[PDB]
């Protein structure tokens, strides 16, 4: 339809400090969350039912990501490591050591034989999942790296940084293939490829989201009306029903825009602190949102379209 009708269905409480990231498993069954409380929690994606806690990091966790088969998780921590987890057993399979400071972001490639990470140390690292060895260290940026993401076939990596740049990397060679810069270079707080891999969605700490044609190297859409000047807030493409852009905001709301018209179609009220993370379910019209220290809860919202 014209607008979605997301309504609050479940509030997931359990973390005792700020929640940093929420991610749906590719198979749609689970939600994983990470927190400053050093814990990963697993929850039912459709019922919000608490499943289990996964522990081991020595400091707070900034991000979590699923393998393509929904069996593994990778986490990125202030303790300067990433950990690879077998979700079913809760086992830490590997600890990925190499970054010299806080690890902020992580992702598996589609094949899930590789992990990419970004750190406060200004590097992007590519890791082998099976051995846990660092395969490449990319001298990616001149300030902390806020996000890293593989494209649809894993041949490219996009990275964003407080240095105001988005960079595109060849996975195989580690070569920088593109540096994206618009009219200014405010800190880039988030970036990801579109599902089809033709565009990149990037957030900057000037209350702006932008859709880029990275190949042409041109900004196609701009999304505004939300508050984002301090925190690295995750954004998403919603594609299960109407085509939306979804993001958290520092006014405690989840914002939803029409991708094409750039109009705000919904604002979701409920959280009591900054909404730092949102996720969109892979097959159903379900959004997960998570908030910082004064809230500590995760919310599941559902729409008919
Ligand atoms: C709750 C919590 C932690 F326990 C640890 C780190 C963070 C955090 O702010 N991570 C972060 C830091 C920077 N930075 O200072 O350059 C940039 C990006 C992130 N994040 C926020 C969480 N997003 C899922 C991943 C990237 C957060 Cl929110």
From Swiss-Prot:
One Gene Ontology MF term: histone binding
Locations listed in the record: Nucleus
InterPro entries: G-protein_beta_WD-40_rep (IPR020472), WD40/YVTN_repeat-like_dom_sf (IPR015943), WD40_repeat_CS (IPR019775), WD40_repeat_dom_sf (IPR036322), WD40_rpt (IPR001680)
WD repeats by residue range: 14-53, 56-97, 99-139, 140-179, 183-224, 227-267, 270-304
Positions where N6-acetyllysine occurs in the chain: 83
Task performed by this protein: Contributes to histone modification. May position the N-terminus of histone H3 for efficient trimethylation at 'Lys-4'. As part of the MLL1/MLL complex it is involved in methylation and dimethylation at 'Lys-4' of histone H3. H3 'Lys-4' methylation represents a specific tag for epigenetic transcriptional activation. As part of the NSL complex it may be involved in acetylation of nucleosomal histone H4 on several lysine residues. May regulate osteoblasts differentiation.
Protein name per its UniProtKB record: WD repeat-containing protein 5
Species: Homo sapiens
Gene name, Swiss-Prot/TrEMBL: WDR5
């Amino acid at each position: 339809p014209v607008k979605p009708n997301y309504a609050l269905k479940f509030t997931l409480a359990g973390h005792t400090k700020a929640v940093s990231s929420v991610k749906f498993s590719p198979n749609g069954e689970w939600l994983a969350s990470s927190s400053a409380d050093k814990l990963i929690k697993i929850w039912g994606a459709y019922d919000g039912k608490f499943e289990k806690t996964i522990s081991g990091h020595k400091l707070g966790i900034s991000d979590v990501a699923w393998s393509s088969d929904s069996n593994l998780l990778v986490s990125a921590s202030d303790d300067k490591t990433l950990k690879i987890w077998d979700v079913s057993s809760g086992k830490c399979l590997k600890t990925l050591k190499g970054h010299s400071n806080y690890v902020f972001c992580c992702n598996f490639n589609p094949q899930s034989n590789l992990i990419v990470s970004g750190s406060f140390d200004e590097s992007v690292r590519i890791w082998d999942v099976k051995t846990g060895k660092c395969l490449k260290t990319l001298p990616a940026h001149s300030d902390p790296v806020s996000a890293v993401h593989f494209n649809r076939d894993g041949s490219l990596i996009v990275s964003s940084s407080y240095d105001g740049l988005c960079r595109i990397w060849d996975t195989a060679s580690g070569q920088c293939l593109k540096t994206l810069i618009d009219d200014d270079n405010p800190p880039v707080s988030f970036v990801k490829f579109s599902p089809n891999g033709k565009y990149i969605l990037a957030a900057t700490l000037d209350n702006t989201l932008k859709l880029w044609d990275y190949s042409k190297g041109k900004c196609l859409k701009t999304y505004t009306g939300h508050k984002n000047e301090k925190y690295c807030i995750f954004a998403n493409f919603s594609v299960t029903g109407g085509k939306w852009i979804v993001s958290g905001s520092e006014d405690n709301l989840v914002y939803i825009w029409n991708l094409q018209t750039k109009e705000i179609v919904q604002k979701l009220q409920g959280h009591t602190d900054v909404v730092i993370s949102t996720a969109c379910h892979p097959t159903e019209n379900i959004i997960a949102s998570a908030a910082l220290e004064n809230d500590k809860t995760i919310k599941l919202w559902k729409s008919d379209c």
